[PDB]
Amino acid sequence: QQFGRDIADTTDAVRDPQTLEILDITPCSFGGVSVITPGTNTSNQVAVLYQGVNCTEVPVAIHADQLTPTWRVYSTGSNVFQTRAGCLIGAEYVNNSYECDIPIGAGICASYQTQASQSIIAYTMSLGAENSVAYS
Amino acid sequence: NNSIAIPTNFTISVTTEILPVSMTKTSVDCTMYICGDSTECSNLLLQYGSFCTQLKRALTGIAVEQDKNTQEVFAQVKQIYKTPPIKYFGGFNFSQILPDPSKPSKRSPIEDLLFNKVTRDLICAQKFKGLTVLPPLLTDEMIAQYTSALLAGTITSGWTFGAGPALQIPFPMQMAYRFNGIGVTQNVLYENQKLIANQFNSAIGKIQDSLSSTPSALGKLQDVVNHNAQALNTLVKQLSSKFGAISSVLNDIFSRLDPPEAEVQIDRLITGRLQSLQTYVTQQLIRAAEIRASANLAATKMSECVLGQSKRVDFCGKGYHLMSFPQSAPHGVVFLHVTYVPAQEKNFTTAPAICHDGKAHFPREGVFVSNGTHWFVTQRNFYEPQIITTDNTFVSGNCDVVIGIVNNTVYDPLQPE
Amino acid sequence: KFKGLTVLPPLLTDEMIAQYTSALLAGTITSGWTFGAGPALQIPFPMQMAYRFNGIGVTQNVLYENQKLIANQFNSAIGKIQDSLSSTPSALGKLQDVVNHNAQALNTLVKQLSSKFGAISSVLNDIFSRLDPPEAEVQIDRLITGRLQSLQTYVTQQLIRAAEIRASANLAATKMSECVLGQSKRVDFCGKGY
Amino acid sequence: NNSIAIPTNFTISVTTEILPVSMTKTSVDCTMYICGDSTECSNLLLQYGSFCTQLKRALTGIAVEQDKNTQEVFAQVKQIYKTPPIKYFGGFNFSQI
Numbered sequence A: 001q002q003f004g005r006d007i008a009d010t011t012d013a014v015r016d017p018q019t020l021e022i023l024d025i026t027p028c029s030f031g032g033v034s035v036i037t038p039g040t041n042t043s044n045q046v047a048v049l050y051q052g053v054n055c056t057e058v059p060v061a062i063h064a065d066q067l068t069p070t071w072r073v074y075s076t077g078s079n080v081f082q083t084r085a086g087c088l089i090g091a092e093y094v095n096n097s098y099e100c101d102i103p104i105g106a107g108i109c110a111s112y113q114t115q116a117s118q119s120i121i122a123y124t125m126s127l128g129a130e131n132s133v134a135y136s
Numbered sequence B: 001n002n003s004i005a006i007p008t009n010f011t012i013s014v015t016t017e018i019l020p021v022s023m024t025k026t027s028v029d030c031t032m033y034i035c036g037d038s039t040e041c042s043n044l045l046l047q048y049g050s051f052c053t054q055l056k057r058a059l060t061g062i063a064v065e066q067d068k069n070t071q072e073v074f075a076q077v078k079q080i081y082k083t084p085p086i087k088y089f090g091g092f093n094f095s096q097i098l099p100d101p102s103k104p105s106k107r108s109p110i111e112d113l114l115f116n117k118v119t120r121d122l123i124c125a126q127k128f129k130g131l132t133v134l135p136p137l138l139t140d141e142m143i144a145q146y147t148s149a150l151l152a153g154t155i156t157s158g159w160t161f162g163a164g165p166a167l168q169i170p171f172p173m174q175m176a177y178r179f180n181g182i183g184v185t186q187n188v189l190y191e192n193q194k195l196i197a198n199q200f201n202s203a204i205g206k207i208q209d210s211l212s213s214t215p216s217a218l219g220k221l222q223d224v225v226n227h228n229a230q231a232l233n234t235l236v237k238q239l240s241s242k243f244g245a246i247s248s249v250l251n252d253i254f255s256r257l258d259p260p261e262a263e264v265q266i267d268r269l270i271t272g273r274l275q276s277l278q279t280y281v282t283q284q285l286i287r288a289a290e291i292r293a294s295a296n297l298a299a300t301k302m303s304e305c306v307l308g309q310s311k312r313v314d315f316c317g318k319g320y321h322l323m324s325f326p327q328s329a330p331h332g333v334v335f336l337h338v339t340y341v342p343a344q345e346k347n348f349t350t351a352p353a354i355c356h357d358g359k360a361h362f363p364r365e366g367v368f369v370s371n372g373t374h375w376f377v378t379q380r381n382f383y384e385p386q387i388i389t390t391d392n393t394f395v396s397g398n399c400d401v402v403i404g405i406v407n408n409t410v411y412d413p414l415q416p417e
Numbered sequence C: 001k002f003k004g005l006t007v008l009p010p011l012l013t014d015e016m017i018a019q020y021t022s023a024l025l026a027g028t029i030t031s032g033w034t035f036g037a038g039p040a041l042q043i044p045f046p047m048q049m050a051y052r053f054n055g056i057g058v059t060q061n062v063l064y065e066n067q068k069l070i071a072n073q074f075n076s077a078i079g080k081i082q083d084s085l086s087s088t089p090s091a092l093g094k095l096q097d098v099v100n101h102n103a104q105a106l107n108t109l110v111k112q113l114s115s116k117f118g119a120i121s122s123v124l125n126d127i128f129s130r131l132d133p134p135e136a137e138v139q140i141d142r143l144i145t146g147r148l149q150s151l152q153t154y155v156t157q158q159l160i161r162a163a164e165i166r167a168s169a170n171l172a173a174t175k176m177s178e179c180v181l182g183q184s185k186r187v188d189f190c191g192k193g194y
Numbered sequence D: 001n002n003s004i005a006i007p008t009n010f011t012i013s014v015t016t017e018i019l020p021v022s023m024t025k026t027s028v029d030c031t032m033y034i035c036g037d038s039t040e041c042s043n044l045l046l047q048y049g050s051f052c053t054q055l056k057r058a059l060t061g062i063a064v065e066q067d068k069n070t071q072e073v074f075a076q077v078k079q080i081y082k083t084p085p086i087k088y089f090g091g092f093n094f095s096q097i
């Protein structure tokens, strides 16, 4: 058996012609990039969500050739938070909960809030104000 | 002409309505699907305009639509109501529908059953072809918190929290309100409170067994998941089509042919793959419209069945609607409709009016019934025979006009005193 | 059919749908609302109509004192229904339109079998005979992709019209529940008036 | 400020509402529609792959949906109630319906 194909008839494994050593072919690391912006009127600050990857494994490219976005400055930055949607770089996670402003996913939202330089923060969205009805 | 069937008993019936509210949010990397690792194919695809951008825009609209659907169905209430620590509620047992603190998810037993029922790997193979799944904005725990808040509001405040501030009411009095809503007097409930509570508890217990026993009970949800997965698989399989080219592999076409011949073959492959993507996106839009209609129905049922008592027939279950309970399910909602069903009907002789003196008397709120020798006035949905008096009847005209009028005495309460 | 487009029979025969309508209407006459919400409870029809008068805010004595007049009005209106259906060509147009759409769409599909789609001919055998097999295959695949596009367009439009028909049928089922199995207080949901 | 209109009479009005519940159920053959009698075209058709699997699946879904629509509209009641032999009904005439 010289090689193997996946469902889409794409080669996913191959036998080396010289060494006859079996090799799996996995496509190079790829993913979606989402830019959370408060609005260019409000600010030029942004946050970057790398979707469906742990940011142990976010682009750590040190040369422009190694990875397609040539903007490395928003990778492995000071503000790094892991979500189930992806890992978000450039927004500080706060334990406070607010009404959703910019949806990120898995219950995490982002907002541009003052805290006193105003910056992008990430938080768990607030479902509402808790109440207890005085049942008797 | 003169026979009426009056129910002498009732059944508290709990039924389940299962409604999809959201579908899987999918994203397609258009370049990675049309041109996996061929940069030449990517440069050629740049010449096809805004096809990929339009597909991305449509899929993003679908995903935002799914989040909006879930928000409309479950985020109706802005207060996260909590059930009281003492769960008595007049003998009505809500443990199967109330959140269970022992479970880490804070999910009810029925909801836990619902979540259990709905279900290289296919995910990895699809991802390697540019097809990925975006997580929903609201977690399953957040949707469970919405359902728990809705249940707590319904149990502690009736329908008041739906129309404004939550107003505490004892649950037996709320269910008496609901019997008034279905046309049955409060005394029927207060006199039969233990029986009604036991019937409700037994029906709620049978709900879990009915959901467990039938594999296809939640099929309406599962089908939605299936309808997504198959579609994605179809897309992946459409990457094996040559579309009239020498090969389905872009790299083989480029390696084997000079630029003029390769262009004719890569054009065929790119056109076929773009057609496959357009077909997928169009069918996703149609399915998203169907899911939006389903979620709009679910939101309407949340408003009119859970946040109130509906007089619409069969909108909130089979029978006379009393109240409803929401339960979160994977990509959907299950409404437990508690309804009142008349039972143990009995035949009686009936007359449109009673002729007393020269006056015709009509029942103010009920029916004139006869067991064979004596005439009573009873409420329509329950047999509670009462003596015909001037209090429970009103007078209109002479006896001649009414067809079917029967002679009988109308007792005057004040005359003895 | 000879071009590959066939029509499948509906699962319910028109006789079975007639039996459903007969059962629903007999239940409405004999039992009023009761069969909709549970066991069918016998009610004399004048008393059911008096209930329905109470539902709209009118007392029972109004119906009982005017029973003959109300019955005559109902009989006259039902008599006028058949004439009104006869007179207006568009009275059932909403039905006919649906049929027309289906019937028209199929013809379009059939007509798309007479389109060259840029090739020399719309007949496959003529293209194969009049061209070299490598040259002929290009035109044949052009015809094939054109016919696949026609089929996909037909299926997409059928999906959209099926969504519209599903919305209409959901509305019809809601009207069966709320207008036939009950008395509705929703304004204009079950006709003009109370 | 002080004037009301009170009805002194009534009309029993019967109106019609027409609602389509189902459409014609159609099935399509790619093999015959695309390639009427050409086995050569039939063999060429497999190159395009799963288009007709998808099309047949969609049409079958529509066809099942039509029967589901008819069930939803007309099969609401599971008891086939039978009208009484004697059709008096208090002077109301239902012979037309």
Ligand SMILES: *[C@@H]1O[C@H](CO)[C@@H](O[C@@H]2O[C@H](CO)[C@@H](O)[C@H](O)[C@H]2NC(C)=O)[C@H](O)[C@H]1NC(C)=O
Binding pocket: B008, B009, B010, B011, B195, B198, B199, B344
């Ligand atoms: C109304 O129906 C209920 C059942 O839903 C009757 O209660 C049952 O009565 C039988 C015999 O009397 C007992 O064996 C059951 O244990 C009872 N069940 C419950 C839940 O109470 C009730 O008696 C009926 N009422 C009338 C007036 O007929």
Ligand SMILES: *[C@@H]1O[C@H](CO)[C@@H](O[C@@H]2O[C@H](CO)[C@@H](O)[C@H](O)[C@H]2NC(C)=O)[C@H](O)[C@H]1NC(C)=O
Binding pocket: B093, B094, B095, B096, B205
């Ligand atoms: C409410 O109902 C639940 C079950 O639906 C009751 O829990 C059961 O209690 C019995 C006896 O106490 C046990 O034998 C079962 O094993 C329990 N089942 C579960 C799932 O807990 C509960 O006791 C009821 N609450 C009240 C106040 O009666």
Ligand SMILES: *[C@@H]1O[C@H](CO)[C@@H](O[C@@H]2O[C@H](CO)[C@@H](O)[C@H](O)[C@H]2NC(C)=O)[C@H](O)[C@H]1NC(C)=O
Binding pocket: B371, B372, B373, B374
């Ligand atoms: C119809 O109902 C009346 C009233 O309940 C019955 O008359 C009563 O019968 C009981 C005996 O079963 C006596 O103790 C009461 O004094 C009677 N009341 C009156 C006002 O006479 C009557 O027997 C019932 N008839 C039938 C056929 O059930």
Ligand SMILES: *[C@@H]1O[C@H](CO)[C@@H](O[C@@H]2O[C@H](CO)[C@@H](O)[C@H](O)[C@H]2NC(C)=O)[C@H](O)[C@H]1NC(C)=O
Binding pocket: C069, C072, D008, D009, D010
């Ligand atoms: C209410 O309207 C009905 C007609 O819809 C009236 O009935 C008419 O009465 C007149 C005089 O009694 C007769 O000449 C007509 O033949 C009747 N028409 C029908 C269709 O029966 C009825 O009189 C009106 N009532 C009031 C109080 O005005």
Ligand SMILES: *[C@@H]1O[C@H](CO)[C@@H](O[C@@H]2O[C@H](CO)[C@@H](O)[C@H](O)[C@H]2NC(C)=O)[C@H](O)[C@H]1NC(C)=O
Binding pocket: D093, D094, D095, D096
């Ligand atoms: C119910 O209405 C039908 C018509 O819809 C009546 O049948 C008509 O009766 C008259 C006189 O007997 C005839 O001139 C017509 O030709 C009949 N038409 C039809 C279609 O049968 C029927 O008599 C009415 N029922 C009652 C009890 O009056």
Ligand SMILES: *[C@@H]1O[C@H](CO)[C@@H](O)[C@H](O)[C@H]1NC(C)=O
Binding pocket: A054, A055, A056, A057
């Ligand atoms: C983070 O990524 C690492 C690297 O593969 C993985 O081992 C780990 O499970 C990830 N953590 C989470 C919470 O996903």
Ligand SMILES: *[C@@H]1O[C@H](CO)[C@@H](O)[C@H](O)[C@H]1NC(C)=O
Binding pocket: B001, D086, D088
């Ligand atoms: C009473 O019912 C019988 C049979 O249902 C019917 O023949 C008779 O006409 C009815 N009474 C009157 C006054 O019409």
Ligand SMILES: *[C@@H]1O[C@H](CO)[C@@H](O)[C@H](O)[C@H]1NC(C)=O
Binding pocket: B005, B345, B346, B347
């Ligand atoms: C009422 O009487 C009819 C005829 O006598 C009978 O068929 C029916 O079963 C009776 N219903 C009840 C509830 O007794």
Ligand SMILES: *[C@@H]1O[C@H](CO)[C@@H](O)[C@H](O)[C@H]1NC(C)=O
Binding pocket: B355, B357, B407
């Ligand atoms: C009882 O009804 C009959 C039927 O018309 C009537 O003749 C009689 O006068 C009535 N009895 C009264 C009014 O005491």
Ligand SMILES: *[C@@H]1O[C@H](CO)[C@@H](O)[C@H](O)[C@H]1NC(C)=O
Binding pocket: D001
């Ligand atoms: C009565 O109506 C007139 C004109 O419509 C208005 O000016 C007047 O204020 C009304 N009556 C009262 C008490 O306001």
